[PDB]
Amino acid sequence: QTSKYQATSVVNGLLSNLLPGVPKIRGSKAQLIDRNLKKRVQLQNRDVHKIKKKCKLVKKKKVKKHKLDKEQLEQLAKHQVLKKHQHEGTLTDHERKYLNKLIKRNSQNLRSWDLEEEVRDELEDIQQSILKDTVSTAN
Amino acid sequence: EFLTFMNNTFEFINKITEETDVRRNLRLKVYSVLLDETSDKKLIRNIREEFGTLLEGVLFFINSVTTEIKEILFKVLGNVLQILPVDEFVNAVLPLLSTSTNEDIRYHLTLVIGSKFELEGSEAIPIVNNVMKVLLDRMPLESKSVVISQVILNTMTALVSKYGKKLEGSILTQALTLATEKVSSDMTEVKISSLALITNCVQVLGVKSIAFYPKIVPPSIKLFDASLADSSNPLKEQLQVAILLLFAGLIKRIPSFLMSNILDVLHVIYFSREVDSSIRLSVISLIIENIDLKEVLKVLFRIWSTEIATSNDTVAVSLFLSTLESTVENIDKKSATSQSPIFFKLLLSLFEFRSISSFDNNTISRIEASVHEISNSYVLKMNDKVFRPLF
Amino acid sequence: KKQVEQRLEFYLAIQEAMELYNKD
Amino acid sequence: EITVDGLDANQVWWQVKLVLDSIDGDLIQGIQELK
RNA sequence: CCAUCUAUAAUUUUGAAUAAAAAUUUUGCCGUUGCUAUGGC
Known about the structure:
This is part of a larger assembly, with chains A, B, C and D. Helix content of chain B is 78%, strand content 0%. By secondary structure, chain B is an all-alpha fold.
């Protein structure tokens, strides 16, 4: 029966690749002739191409999802390796650049909140005026 | 008692191995070792060797199992399969196939290998090349076991279908040579797997498979004749579909080379009783838009006089009519005129079908109606000069 | 209330290969 | 290679036709250079 | 639509018989109640 199931599965796969619209494997004679002739035109009018498109799009989503899972998972393991190497001082040349980039990234971010050099000029000038009156220091 | 405890025993390995934090996940720890360059290589081979025993151990329980305990084992196996990547999976599993002495276990290991490639991409092309060299070498060894023999061929079929073109050519040709030899295998399973592999291999190779053409089609036609004789075969329907699908694939890939042997192809389609009419009628169309029509019309006369006329089979006659009507509605102006004498010669025989036909009046009348419309279609679409002698 | 009540109500592949082999 | 074993004249010609037609393109181009 | 031809069904011959073969021509759902009739939605 695995003989049977394996037999069906292989031929079913071939059918989809070659004849997508055809169903898978699982009276008066004149009427039979007429039916087959009718089956010809409707099969000829079948829209196979969109069927081939649908199976592709279904498969592509699964492959894409798994690829993202692999992409996400290795980064976590990659970042773990950076932790242990850094704590033990086993940093390679590559790892010493990735963190150095992070220094630039974070330091670059903090620059926006550090404000401009032009503003601190008058802020400092205004800053001193208000101290000297509240702090006094003439006496 | 023991079973209840044994049922509990497999809840643990499920619970521990279940992928419910970098530290907790057994899966994630494995990659960190692999990604860590400083990790000893002798440490890595321990992971590969240790996993193989674990995978073999769980399969042994599955092979030798109880429904609920059976269910848990797959939960355990699924966790086990995802512990390590495809790169290490193949290296830690392919050696075990020869090492494994149990036919059931070997039957299991083949399935899991295919499942890993079901969702892989072009990154596994070097991996897949390694696997084929192993699977090809195991085929002569595993020829005794049909189930193992069938599965290995099936796995090769799925993966030659998937990015088979990118695989190194030497493996492809070797696979084709392997498949053709196994076509003659007495067991029906090996044939259908053999035919299936030939379809994809011929599909990828295309014209490069012409060297094997004498080893593909003439055996298949002989196989079909044997297929009719052994009507007690439980896989007769599957076997016949395999023969038809074999032709359908190569009708798309190598039309020109098949025109000479096109006659026997139609003989297969018309007299393949078990296969569904939709399957047959589909492959009738492919012949029309892939093979030169002029050759077909020449053959339609010979096959009609030889077999279909005396066949007395409703399906065969209807299929023949579907071919003839499809050809005439597609045949060109120039080709129709040149082939006119043969068509009219066939037309006279069709008119005389009533004399020999064993069917009732209604069928013959309906058949004659189809003959007249195609004749009207065929006599139209020509000029006066060609028709005047024929008239 | 009973009228309101009625209104309230109104509104793996390899696994298969594994099992099928064992049955044989 | 043009396979002739177990193949009729028509099939052999198709192998000949595909090969020669492909070889026609570069041969003509080579002739143009040599002229 | 009418006729005709088929299809379905019934009697009959070889036939233990199957078999072929001439031949002819009460509900959409759910129950109860009989071996038929009526209760709910």
